[PDB]
Structure 1
Amino acid sequence: KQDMPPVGGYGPIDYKRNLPRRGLSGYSMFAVGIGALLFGYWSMMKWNRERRRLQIEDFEARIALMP
């Protein structure tokens, strides 16, 4: 008279299938990308242009000597 099945206490667990979490898609991407990339080239032309100014100063000390 000592046998298994309980009178109660059950679930069940699902048979389902779901993890579609979105996700920042669909014109949200391709907009943060271009907005990041244009910040890069804007951070250029303030350094590459400025290094071009110090470049001429480096040639300047050459030319003021050599006679």
Structure 2
Amino acid sequence: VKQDMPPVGGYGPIDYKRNLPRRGLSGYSMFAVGIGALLFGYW
């Protein structure tokens, strides 16, 4: 017989969980860069 069937080893794993990358520079470092740009422009 012949019908639509999954393969004899089954299908592969399928991801379903939430996965967000999460990326950042620190707030103290960003404020330091802003202070440096401010002083360079003022000079």
Same fold per TM (> 0.5)?
yes
* 1:10 Cα offset (Å): 2.3
In the superposition, the TM-score normalised over structure 2's length comes to 0.59
TM-score normalised by length of structure 1? 0.45
The SS at the match of 2:35 is helix
Rg: which structure is higher?
1
**Higher helix proportion (structure 1 or 2):** 1
Count of residues in Structure 1 that have an aligned counterpart in Structure 2: 41
The CA RMSD over aligned residues, in Å, is 2.0
Deviation at 1:40, TM superposition (A): 0.1
Percent pairwise identity: 100
What do the CA deviations read for 1:34-55 (whole angstroms, capped 9, x no partner)?
11111000xxxxxxxxxxxxxx
Unmatched tracts of structure 1, length 5 or more: 42-67
Relative to 1, partners in 2 of residues 1:17 and 1:24: Cα closer, same or farther, differing over 3 Å?
A: same
